[PDB]
Design a protein around this ligand. Structure first.
Ligand SMILES: COc1ccccc1NC(C)=O
Lengths: 235, 179
């Protein structure tokens, strides 16, 4: 994660992120809609930070510091590069839409009027197919990854030392190997919850209410195929 | 410091997300209540034992029967939640949630938690329930359900007022420690 985005999403809400004099110039329904859009971007930034801890810190750390058997790191961190690519492109698009919405002379005051189009593009066509195929794979290999992690920690002493060492920072308190896998699996089921609450405060522009309804249907369609595609593998 | 895992389960609007948020949050959500909960590792000291309690939510997983069970591995205590302003969510506790929790988590202690206890004497809640020929869940109805499902215990709390929240999570830590 980068300091710039960490500060832009450091506040507990959109109402606390913007200047109080900018906040006071908006209708309460706009403040409420913006609070949920901000939460969607904030949690997507956290999701991408989770995937980067998995690729750079755990996955790459194990290759460069451990003599683990080939294919064991793949079994521990399935499809993490693919997942990292998908969500980093999505975060990039949400972050640019926020920057576009910035008030000239400000780096914090913005109001996003269009979001549904970005959500429709992400959860439709080839991009939705790629997430469907990737989350179906990741979730079918989830239990085997936890079991493989547990075996390695119970039999290898150098693997124990590596884990103790990388997970020592307080910033990684809720981000151990198993926590990262459950965080990733649980991510996709957050989208309908976030999009429905955004849609609830988006009845000002009818093209937006329809766009957010198309995207809500598209995410639920995706989750149903990801759920149907799950077939748990064993160690 | 031992690591223990807590998972909260229950119907859509049982208040499980609000409960996790109010507990993990240093202060109370005065300005914005978040839509979702990611995870949290709490430092709890109960009866002289120092524990690291990882907290997980199943909100959003209710309709996905092959995805939801991925939340269960290595759980040490289950909070089985229902809403006191919704007697229909209590009927689903033994029919839907208990067979699932016992199949995936055999021998894991379950605490049956009645959330939103403040709505028991709320006027709009009692009027809406009377149209449905119903009333808020009585304390003895919750205890009778906890007894019938073989729960470790029964507890009530209000995430809105914070009453009973700290006691639920300390008891969950005690239940997780017992072997
Ligand atoms: C006009 O609204 C504001 C109030 C206080 C500070 C800044 C602004 N406007 C921008 C565009 O930043």
């Amino acid at each position: 994660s980068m300091e710039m985005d960490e500060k832009d999403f450091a506040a507990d809400s959109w109402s606390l992120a913007v200047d109080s004099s900018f906040l006071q110039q908006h209708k309460k329904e706009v403040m409420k809609q913006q609070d949920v859009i901000y939460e969607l971007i904030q949690t997507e930034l956290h999701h991408v930070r989770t995937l980067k801890i998995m690729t750079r810190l755990f996955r790459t750390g194990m290759l460069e510091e451990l003599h683990l058997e080939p294919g064991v790191v793949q079994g521990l961190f399935p499809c993490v590069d693919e997942l990292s690519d998908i969500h980093t492109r999505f975060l990039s698009q949400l972050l640019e839409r926020r920057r576009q919405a910035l008030c000239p002379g400000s780096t914090r005051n913005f109001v996003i009027h269009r979001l549904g189009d970005l959500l429709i593009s992400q959860f439709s066509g080839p991009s939705a197919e790629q997430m469907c195929k990737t989350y179906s794979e990741f979730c079918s290999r989830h239990s085997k990854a936890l079991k493989l992690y547990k075996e390695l920690y119970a039999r290898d002493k150098r693997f124990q030392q590596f884990i103790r060492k990388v997970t020592r920072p307080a910033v990684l308190k809720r981000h151990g190997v198993q926590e990262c896998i459950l965080l990733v699996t649980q991510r996709i089921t957050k989208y309908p919850l976030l999009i429905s609450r955004i849609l609830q405060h988006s009845h000002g522009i009818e093209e937006e209410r329809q766009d957010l309804t198309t995207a809500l249907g598209l995410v639920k369609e995706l989750l149903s195929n990801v759920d149907e595609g799950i077939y748990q593998l064993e160690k | 410091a031992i690591r223990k895992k807590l998972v909260i389960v229950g119907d859509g609007a049982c208040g499980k997300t609000c409960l996790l948020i109010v507990f993990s949050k240093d202060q109370f959500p005065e300005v914005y209540v978040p839509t979702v909960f990611e995870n949290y590792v709490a430092d709890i000291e109960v009866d002289g034992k120092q524990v690291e309690l990882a907290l997980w939510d199943t909100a959003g997983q209710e309709d996905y029967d092959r995805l939801r069970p991925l939340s269960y591995p290595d759980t040490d205590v289950i909070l089985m939640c229902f809403s006191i302003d919704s007697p229909d969510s209590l009927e689903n506790i033994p029919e839907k949630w208990t067979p699932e929790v016992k199949h995936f988590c055999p021998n894991v202690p379950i605490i049956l938690v009645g959330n939103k206890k403040d709505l028991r004497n709320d006027e709009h809640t009692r009027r809406e329930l009377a149209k449905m020929k119903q009333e808020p869940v009585k304390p003895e109805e919750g205890r009778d359900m906890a007894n019938r499902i073989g729960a470790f215990g029964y507890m009530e709390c209000s995430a809105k007022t914070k009453d009973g929240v700290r006691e639920v999570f300390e008891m969950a830590t005690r239940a997780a420690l017992q072997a």
